[PDB]
Design a protein around this ligand. Structure first.
Ligand code: 0ZI
Lengths: 26, 248, 10
């Protein structure tokens, strides 16, 4: 269960800037 | 945090506030890794040069917060510490090598929408994510400039290649450390700052969509100084000491 | 600065 946030990962909602992290992984 | 923004609610559920009982005051940031274990920097507890040496009764642990200053009436949980564990080889005499410590809670905390643990990296997650250019995220209630926020702040920074890290300071850099921040050229900024110490530097894995704690906010020369970088404790490298103390 | 916490805690 570690690392999955009840208000984002659990409901499938993205936070306002996580896209920037992901776009950087390569 | 400098050049950050307000976090959304539950954006960072592992975020902990180290709080002094008297004077009541924000001590450091920290992270929830299980329902009874908190991870922070050793420098938050012990720094003999400045006469710092906090014991378990000097402290409280506040989990579930969003506001810096208010008692979040049915949102946060305050906890007492059972015991404190410092790396046996943390080097306060020269460079804060192995800047790490574990805090065992008196009683297990209950998870909720505002309280959930972060994962610890494995050799392979470390391998594929700790790479120059990738961005991690830092959060905390520290100073907004080298001043005090109303709500938790967050910034996202790129990791920096060892050489640059090195070429930026006169402190001896060890394998137990890494640095992050943009470059003067990059024309983008932010950093950790006073009061941010001991919080998590996190990454989100693209393979499993899970958040991982790569670093602890260690030390730095100022807050957002051109050609300077924030330094963090290499969590992966000190994994064996972590396991060891929880097993034990 | 800081608001008061329940003595339950302290
Ligand atoms: C209680 C000891 C702490 C050690 C680390 N300290 C810091 O590093 C603060 C922080 C600003 C926050 N910025 C940031 N995180 N990027 N910077 S300092 O006051 O200039 C500073 C204070 C004490 C030790 C420092 C150090 N030693 C390990 C040799 C290296 C560089 C700076 C040091 C704050 C005090």
């Amino acid at each position: 269960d570690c690392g999955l946030r009840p208000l984002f990962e659990k409901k499938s909602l993205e936070d306002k800037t996580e896209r920037e992290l992901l776009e950087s992984y390569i | 945090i400098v050049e950050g923004s307000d976090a959304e609610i539950g954006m960072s559920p592992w975020q902990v506030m180290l709080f002094r009982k008297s004077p009541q005051e924000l001590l450091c940031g920290a992270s929830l890794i299980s329902d009874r274990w908190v991870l922070t920097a050793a420098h938050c507890l012990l720094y003999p040069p400045w006469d710092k040496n906090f014991t378990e009764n000097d402290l409280l642990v506040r989990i579930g917060k969003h506001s810096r200053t208010r008692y979040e009436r049915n949102i946060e949980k305050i906890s007492m510490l059972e015991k404190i564990y410092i790396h046996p080889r943390y080097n306060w005499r020269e460079n804060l090598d192995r800047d790490i410590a574990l805090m065992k809670l008196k009683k297990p905390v209950a998870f909720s929408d505002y309280i959930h643990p972060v994962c610890l990296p494995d050799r392979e997650t470390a391998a594929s994510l700790l790479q120059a250019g990738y961005k991690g995220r830092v959060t905390g209630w520290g100073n907004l400039k080298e001043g005090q926020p109303s709500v938790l702040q967050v910034v996202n920074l790129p990791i920096v290649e060892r050489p640059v890290c090195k070429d930026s300071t006169r402190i001896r850099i060890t394998d137990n450390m890494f640095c992050a921040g943009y470059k003067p050229d990059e024309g983008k900024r932010g950093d950790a700052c006073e009061g941010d110490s001991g919080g998590p530097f996190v990454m989100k894995s693209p393979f499993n969509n899970r958040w991982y704690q790569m670093g602890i906010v260690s030390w730095g020369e100022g807050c957002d100084r051109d050609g300077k970088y924030g330094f963090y404790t290499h969590v992966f490298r000190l994994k064996k000491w972590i396991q060891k103390v929880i097993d034990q | 600065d800081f608001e008061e916490i329940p003595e339950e805690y302290l």
